[PDB]
Amino acid sequence: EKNVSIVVAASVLSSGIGINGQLPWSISEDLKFFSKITNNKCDSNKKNALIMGRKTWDSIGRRPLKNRIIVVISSSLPQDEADPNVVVFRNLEDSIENLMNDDSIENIFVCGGESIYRDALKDNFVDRIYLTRVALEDIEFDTYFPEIPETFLPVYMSQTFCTKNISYDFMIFEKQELKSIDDTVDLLGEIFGIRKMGNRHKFPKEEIYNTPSIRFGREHYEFQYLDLLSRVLENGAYRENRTGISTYSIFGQMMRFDMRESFPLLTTKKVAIRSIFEELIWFIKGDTNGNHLIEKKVYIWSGNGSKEYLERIGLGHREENDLGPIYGFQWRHYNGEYKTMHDDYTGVGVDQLAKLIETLKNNPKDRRHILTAWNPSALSQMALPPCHVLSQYYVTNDNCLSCNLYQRSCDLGLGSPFNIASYAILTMMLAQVCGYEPGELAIFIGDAHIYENHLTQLKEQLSRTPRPFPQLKFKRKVENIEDFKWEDIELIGYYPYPTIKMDMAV
Amino acid sequence: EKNVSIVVAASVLSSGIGINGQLPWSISEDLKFFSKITNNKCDSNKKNALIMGRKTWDSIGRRPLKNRIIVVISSSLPQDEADPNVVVFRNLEDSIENLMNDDSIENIFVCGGESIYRDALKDNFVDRIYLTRVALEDIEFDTYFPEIPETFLPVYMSQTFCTKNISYDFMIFEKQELKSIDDTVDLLGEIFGIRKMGNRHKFPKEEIYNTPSIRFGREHYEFQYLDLLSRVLENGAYRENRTGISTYSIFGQMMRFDMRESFPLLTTKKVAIRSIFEELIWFIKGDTNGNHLIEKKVYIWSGNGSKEYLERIGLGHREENDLGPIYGFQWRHYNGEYKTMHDDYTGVGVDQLAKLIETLKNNPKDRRHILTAWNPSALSQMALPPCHVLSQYYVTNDNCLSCNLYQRSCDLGLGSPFNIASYAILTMMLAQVCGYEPGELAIFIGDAHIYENHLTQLKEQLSRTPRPFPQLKFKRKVENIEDFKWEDIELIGYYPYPTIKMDMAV
Ligand SMILES: NC(=O)C1=CN([C@@H]2O[C@H](COP(=O)(O)OP(=O)(O)OC[C@H]3O[C@@H](n4cnc5c(N)ncnc54)[C@H](OP(=O)(O)O)[C@@H]3O)[C@@H](O)[C@H]2O)C=CC1
Ligand SMILES: NC(=O)C1=CN([C@@H]2O[C@H](COP(=O)(O)OP(=O)(O)OC[C@H]3O[C@@H](n4cnc5c(N)ncnc54)[C@H](OP(=O)(O)O)[C@@H]3O)[C@@H](O)[C@H]2O)C=CC1
Ligand SMILES: CN(Cc1cnc2nc(N)nc(N)c2n1)c1ccc(C(=O)N[C@@H](CCC(=O)O)C(=O)O)cc1
Ligand SMILES: CN(Cc1cnc2nc(N)nc(N)c2n1)c1ccc(C(=O)N[C@@H](CCC(=O)O)C(=O)O)cc1
Ligand SMILES: COc1ccc(C(=O)O)c(NC(=O)c2ccc(Cc3c[nH]c4nc(N)[nH]c(=O)c34)cc2)c1
Ligand SMILES: COc1ccc(C(=O)O)c(NC(=O)c2ccc(Cc3c[nH]c4nc(N)[nH]c(=O)c34)cc2)c1
Ligand SMILES: O=c1[nH]c(=O)n([C@H]2C[C@H](O)[C@@H](COP(=O)(O)O)O2)cc1F
Ligand SMILES: O=c1[nH]c(=O)n([C@H]2C[C@H](O)[C@@H](COP(=O)(O)O)O2)cc1F
């Protein structure tokens, strides 16, 4: 008995693998993966066998692959014995029976087009599936990869990679047919109740774990958000808050995302990326006028900015959407004497963002690149205290800009998908203006919570296996960071699940 | 062949297990652990065998244990058949007959005093060791647990638990004699270099991993600091900084500690706990006069408070140790016009700490319990910008006080052990003044680094297997939080490794 794995690079949605006898794409690193996964063997005196159909054998030039043995499935090709690295069989079945019991062969790989993929799964010959999900769908395919049978479960999903602005994943699918430590920890959990901290951070149950079959291969960094949801649904304490909608809350959580090879925009739900940007540039410009977002069809600050809400918190003297000194005011005019949203605050206050950009490129290894928004002297004047209170930035030795954010209160479901992408765009903006590349984004959270009217919505989101992250590139290089416009943003390869409506708690 | 494990509760240093025919302590949760570990079986029609010496059989009243079979090793006790739950053997070797003959026994446990522990290890009869390390050493013992032979390696170390102000651990020692995901992840790391985020966060090598045999049982929360050291020594980028001493730096790390059942004071080195307190109460009183610490034999702010250093950073107008508006000033007088360290700042500024204590007990579920020290309007006047910039506090549903701290720059080796205990004491002080209990402490770190002159020292610290955390209790309840004194603090059960001298980078 030996192992028979499928290697395939297919589209993310329709599972397309070819067009007009060739690939729909040219990804160098993906072919390198095919090379390394098919050469992976234990015995140096053995070789791996690569099974492929004739039309696929034509697409690779009918030339052998080093250190491997190509098995071509063809009804017409002559069974030439002159080439030992290429053998022909009349059907797929006689090429599995012959490869196994052939001690010179260690592993078997199926990789030969739709006709071979489809008949290898229908006849139950395949043990593993190496899938490369490529985020390209608005093009034309003519050969597809069959739908993965239910007998297979995913066990690994890599981080999203980027080649020529094309996002792709790497997944492993297995066919589903030390313990003394686990016993002792369970016994200690019975003796001590909540006294054992492990019981206060119980591992989420399978019913609330997104794609629970991926146990050890949760490399895709959207799991940093999906698993935080699961940890809240498992350990969240039911608590009241300033609004009429209670939450399930835990304390002290973190999420980290890559920004070099992808953009952390959630794929399990269509995230309103346009509104995220318009709010971010609204912060950068130092603007606290809530109408300037409503004038651009962005209504995320209408609830916390209505006349009825402001009178409720004792700010009835403000205009209809005068949010007061908040994120935008503290970034550009810290400790500035706020009057109204119509006054001219040029020069007043401490321009943190300007000093940040100046310090990022003049003293890159300075570990004080800090942008804060928590000003106790102005909290009473704010329509809402800052949720993302403090961010720190870091220039790596390879000229990348990483970002750390501390968030005191995190509305998973509404605020969190925005904060993940918002500070991701901000770091990219800071990276271009300072002449660096994007690095990493880590979000440290205080009150990570889920509003009780988001439960059926967020549980629906957990039922969706993540897709590769999109790409975010800028159309032009900007002089000043304030000059960014929405038209200057290109969102490449974003194929999310349908949007999920969730009401905001005012 | 069947499993033979040792269950023992011994002292932390001298490994004392008894005195005058009884235990040196009375810990209820430990006996329950003995009960659950010796009753844990797979077959319901089988029983576990507990081997013990005669003197131990006397200490438990010569009465059977439910659902188990006691095996007494005695040269004088008659081999009476009237009790089926108690059997006597003339030597330890002839009592290991449960492996061969008596199939009715599923597991074997040795737990019967020094004479039985010592010759059971000398004759290589033991497979596992369940160790309960009790932090009691300045008392009298007369029977000890033998030194664990090198053939055993620790595989688990629980968090520190507390019973009647006594700290204890739980450890497992083993006798030393699918991987398709790991291959795929390794290959992806060869294709993409630093592009794969996993390669920028490499798992530390065994040569720098503290107690590397404990792979899956790193529950003791001192590992949250020791593994951060290893994570820095593995991925730390060599970088220059404001001092003449370069560091190995990574970005975006976190440590979380329990405070309910223990106090996070590092045991791998004798940490100057008194200096940590005297600095913290110095912060609480709003004091920025560096002499008040030197007058109390606390010299941690002497380097950043020399006349030569102050002139170097452009503060030559200050007195010898006028550190300027820092942690203490921003906590009690935020946005206060600082003059010198001799002026009376009573009433000026925003007293965050007073508002924090006021809001903590009046609005416990308010997710805005934030104490910040990052004031950009005053950074230029500070002798050193705040390293621990922002802390948030959280009241759990069971009336516990958890704490989150964001630290922009973390000197592992000097500042970090201080920052761990400092904010642990601060959270405990806030818990008493507000009427709560200690909860959890999480420290989110930006620039986690190791100064290059701390390398040989921190590698020495990593060679020391951690010991259970101590306990920190207050002698009296205080009226105002400022009234705490060093004599009001009791440090119970702190048995650390010898101190490690490390020079501070000015
Ligand atoms: N993205 C990816 O991972 C991959 C993509 N591709 C692409 O897919 C396309 C090719 O796939 P596809 O169109 O399905 O062609 P195939 O690669 O599946 O090859 C089919 C040929 O194999 C022979 N064959 C197939 N089934 C049998 C059978 N049951 N008995 C006997 N002979 C059989 C036939 O040749 P004959 O007429 O001689 O009998 C048939 O024409 C190309 O574009 C290729 O580049 C290919 C591999 C991988
Ligand atoms: N903290 C913990 O986990 C534990 C602590 N203890 C403590 O340890 C103390 C007891 O230990 P200890 O003083 O060493 O006494 P032991 O419990 O080890 O019992 C010793 C007796 O066992 C018999 N015995 C021992 N070796 C042999 C042998 N080679 N052949 C025949 N008989 C043998 C002898 O009894 P005889 O005279 O009849 O021949 C001997 O007096 C007590 O204080 C007890 O509370 C005990 C167990 C666990
Ligand atoms: C069968 N076929 C089509 C093809 C293309 N992309 C794929 N991508 C994936 N992920 N899986 C496949 N099965 C796959 N198959 C192939 C097979 C090998 C090579 C190839 O040139 N392999 C070289 C790769 C050389 C390199 O790029 O480093 C090797 O050394 O194996 C190209 C197309
Ligand atoms: C042999 N002996 C001395 C003793 C005391 N403390 C220890 N502690 C540890 N961790 N390991 C031991 N082997 C150990 N042995 C014993 C053994 C059993 C009981 C005992 O009362 N056991 C009850 C515990 C009942 C309970 O508190 O729930 C049981 O059900 O097993 C006391 C002393
Ligand atoms: C996922 O589904 C969708 C689809 C579309 C949109 C969209 O804007 O088009 C969307 N976002 C929102 O509605 C949204 C609203 C407010 C904020 C910021 C904010 C200010 N005050 C707050 N108070 C609380 N409690 N929570 C918060 O998040 C905030 C962010 C997002 C969500
Ligand atoms: C672990 O071994 C020992 C033993 C004894 C002592 C002891 O004081 O007795 C000790 N601590 C220190 O020397 C020490 C010095 C300064 C601080 C705070 C601080 C202010 N400015 C800084 N600048 C940098 N770069 N780093 C920093 O840590 C700080 C904390 C600790 C360490
Ligand atoms: O950027 C934001 N991120 C966020 O998580 N919230 C949510 C968190 C919480 O639901 C609410 C904060 O209100 P409070 O912390 O005062 O209870 O806003 C709001 C934002 F604007
Ligand atoms: O409480 C402290 N914590 C801490 O980690 N440091 C260290 C971190 C770093 O080595 C230095 C901060 O100086 P800077 O970050 O400006 O380089 O002090 C200092 C303190 F006072």
Give B384 Cα–ligand 8 centroid separation in angstroms.
8
The kind and range of the H/E element at B10 are: strand B4-11
SS3 assignment, position B45: coil
Beta bridge partners of A108: A4, A49
C-beta atoms surrounding A354 within 10 Å:
13
C-beta atoms surrounding B269 within 10 Å:
20
| A128, A352, A389 ranked by CB distance to B390: nearest | A389
Distances (CA, A) of A242 to A3, B285, B368, B491: 58, 32, 11, 39
Which ligand is nearest to the Cα of residue B94, counting in written order? Answer: 2
Cα–Cα distance measured from residue A387 to residue A226, given in angstroms and rounded to the nearest whole number: 20
Q: Which of B255, B208, B247, B264 is nearest to B462 (CA)?
A: B208
CA A187 vs. chain centroid, Å, equals 37
SS3 assignment, position B466: coil
Cα–Cα distance measured from residue B351 to residue B334, given in angstroms and rounded to the nearest whole number: 7
Are A129 and A172 in contact by the 8 Å Cβ rule? The answer is: yes
8 Å CB contact of B372 and A367: no
C-beta atoms surrounding A440 within 10 Å:
24
Radius of gyration of chain B (CA): 27
Instruction: Give the DSSP per-residue string, A478-506.
Output: -SSGGG--GGGEEEES--PPPP---PPP-
SS3 assignment, position B224: helix
Beta bridge partners of A250: A448
The kind and range of the H/E element at B390 are: strand B388-395
DSSP annotation of A56 reads H
Which ligand is nearest to the Cα of residue A168, counting in written order? Answer: 3
Cα–Cα distance measured from residue A39 to residue A56, given in angstroms and rounded to the nearest whole number: 19
Q: Which residue has the tokens 């004479």?
A: B115
Cα–Cα distance measured from residue A317 to residue A311, given in angstroms and rounded to the nearest whole number: 8
Are A277 and A489 in contact by the 8 Å Cβ rule? The answer is: yes
For residue B61, with 0-12 CB atoms within 10 Å meaning exposed, 13-18 middle and 19 or more buried, which class applies? exposed
Give which of B365, B367, B403, B447 to mutate to test A binding, by max A Cβ within 10 Å. B367
Q: Annotated binding residue at A9?
A: yes
Going by their DSSP bridges, the two strands B437-451 and B400-411 should be labelled as parallel
8 Å CB contact of B32 and A191: yes
8 Å CB contact of B191 and A33: yes
Question: Which superfamily, per CATH, for B223-506?
Answer: Thymidylate synthase/dCMP hydroxymethylase domain (3.30.572.10)
Cα–Cα distance measured from residue B421 to residue B257, given in angstroms and rounded to the nearest whole number: 10
Which ligand is nearest to the Cα of residue B142, counting in written order? Answer: 2
Rounded to whole angstroms, the maximal C-alpha distance in chain A is 92
Q: Which atom of ligand 4 is nearest to the CA of B6?
A: 13
CB of B116 shorter than 6 A to ligand 4: no
The CA angle B212-B217-B219, to the nearest 5 degrees, is: 110
SS3 assignment, position A123: coil
Give B119 Cα–ligand 7 centroid separation in angstroms.
63
Q: Which residue has the tokens 């025919």?
A: B21
Selected catalytic residue, list B42, B111, B162, B387:
B387
C-beta atoms surrounding A421 within 10 Å:
23
Instruction: Give the DSSP per-residue string, A432-496.
Output: HHHT-EEEEEEEEEEEEEEEGGGHHHHHHHHTS------EEEESS--SSGGG--GGGEEEES--P
Q: Annotated binding residue at A76?
A: yes
Distances (CA, A) of A24 to A143, A169, A496, B131: 10, 16, 21, 61
Cα–Cα distance measured from residue A250 to residue A231, given in angstroms and rounded to the nearest whole number: 8
In this structure, which long-range contacts are made by residues A396-400, counting pairs with CB atoms below 8 Å and at least 24 apart in sequence? Answer: A396/A439, A396/B237, A396/B251, A397/B237, A397/B238, A397/B239, A398/A437, A398/B194, A399/A435, A399/A436, A399/A437, A400/A260, A400/A431, A400/A436, A400/A437, A400/A438, A400/A439, A400/A440
The kind and range of the H/E element at B109 are: strand B105-110
Are A474 and A491 in contact by the 8 Å Cβ rule? The answer is: no
Q: Which of B20, B488, B66, B10 is nearest to B277 (CA)?
A: B488
Q: How far is B22 from chain A (nearest CA, A)?
A: 23
Enumerate residues 6+ apart whose C-beta is below 8 A from B57: B70, B72, B74, B77, B112
Give A414 Cα–ligand 5 centroid separation in angstroms.
5
The kind and range of the H/E element at B310 are: helix B307-312
Going by their DSSP bridges, the two strands B16-18 and B68-73 should be labelled as unpaired
Structure tokens at B375: 């004031």
Are A273 and A265 in contact by the 8 Å Cβ rule? The answer is: yes
Q: Which of A103, A480, A154, A74 is nearest to A286 (CA)?
A: A480
Cα–Cα distance measured from residue B21 to residue A467, given in angstroms and rounded to the nearest whole number: 65
Give which of A39, A197, A388 to mutate to test B binding, by max B Cβ within 10 Å. A197
Beta bridge partners of B71: B51, B87
| A180, A241, A392 ranked by CB distance to B365: nearest | A241
Distances (CA, A) of B385 to A193, A298, B325, B382: 42, 38, 9, 6
Cα–Cα distance measured from residue A121 to residue A432, given in angstroms and rounded to the nearest whole number: 48
Are B8 and B129 in contact by the 8 Å Cβ rule? The answer is: yes
Q: Where are the domains of chain A?
A: 1-176, 177-222, 223-506
Instruction: Provide the phi-psi class of A356: left if phi over 0, else alpha when psi is between -120 and 50, else beta.
Output: alpha
Cα–Cα distance measured from residue A4 to residue A7, given in angstroms and rounded to the nearest whole number: 10
8 Å CB contact of A188 and B33: yes
C-beta atoms surrounding A97 within 10 Å:
11
DSSP annotation of B302 reads S
Torsion of Cα atoms, A356 then A358 then A360 then A361, to 10° = 170
Cα–Cα distance measured from residue B475 to residue B488, given in angstroms and rounded to the nearest whole number: 5
Torsion A105-A109-A112-A114 (CA) sign: positive
For residue B369, with 0-12 CB atoms within 10 Å meaning exposed, 13-18 middle and 19 or more buried, which class applies? buried
Q: Which of A304, A306, A308, A352 is nearest to A328 (CA)?
A: A352
Q: Which residue has the tokens 């920004």?
A: A259
The CA angle A114-A117-A119, to the nearest 5 degrees, is: 105
Cα–Cα distance measured from residue A421 to residue B441, given in angstroms and rounded to the nearest whole number: 28
Beta bridge partners of A72: A52, A88
Q: Which of A247, A246, A207, A201 is nearest to A228 (CA)?
A: A201
8 Å CB contact of B240 and A365: yes
Give which of A30, A132, A176, A180 to mutate to test B binding, by max B Cβ within 10 Å. A180
For residue B260, with 0-12 CB atoms within 10 Å meaning exposed, 13-18 middle and 19 or more buried, which class applies? buried
CA A460 vs. chain centroid, Å, equals 18
Cα–Cα distance measured from residue A15 to residue A137, given in angstroms and rounded to the nearest whole number: 9
Q: Which of A93, A95, A462, A104 is nearest to A266 (CA)?
A: A462
8 Å CB contact of A372 and B374: yes
Structure tokens at B345: 């700042």
Cα–Cα distance measured from residue A492 to residue A408, given in angstroms and rounded to the nearest whole number: 32
Distances (CA, A) of B208 to B12, B203, B235: 24, 10, 12
Pocket test of ligand 2: the residue of B19, B77, B79, B116 to mutate, having most ligand atoms within 8 Å of its CB, is: B116
Is it true that A177-222 and A223-506 share their CATH fold?
Answer: yes
Fold category of A1-176 in CATH: Dihydrofolate Reductase, subunit A (3.40.430)
Q: Which of B276, B387, B367, B269 is nearest to B326 (CA)?
A: B387
Are A120 and A182 in contact by the 8 Å Cβ rule? The answer is: no
Torsion A10-A12-A16-A20 (CA) sign: negative
Residue B93: phi, psi to the nearest 5? -70, -45
Torsion A491-A497-A501-A502 (CA) sign: negative
Q: How far is B141 from chain A (nearest CA, A)?
A: 27
Resolution in A: 2.8
The kind and range of the H/E element at B143 are: strand B143-144
Amino acid at B106: E
Beta strands in A97-209 (DSSP E): 105-110, 128-134, 143-144, 152-157, 161-163, 166-168, 171-175
Are B87 and B71 in contact by the 8 Å Cβ rule? The answer is: yes
Thinking of the domain A177-222, which architecture would CATH place it in?
Answer: 2-Layer Sandwich (3.30)
SS3 assignment, position B491: strand
Cα–Cα distance measured from residue B160 to residue B134, given in angstroms and rounded to the nearest whole number: 10
Q: Which residues of A are catalytic?
A: 387
Q: Which atom of ligand 1 is nearest to the CA of A115?
A: 18
Beta bridge partners of B391: B371, B405
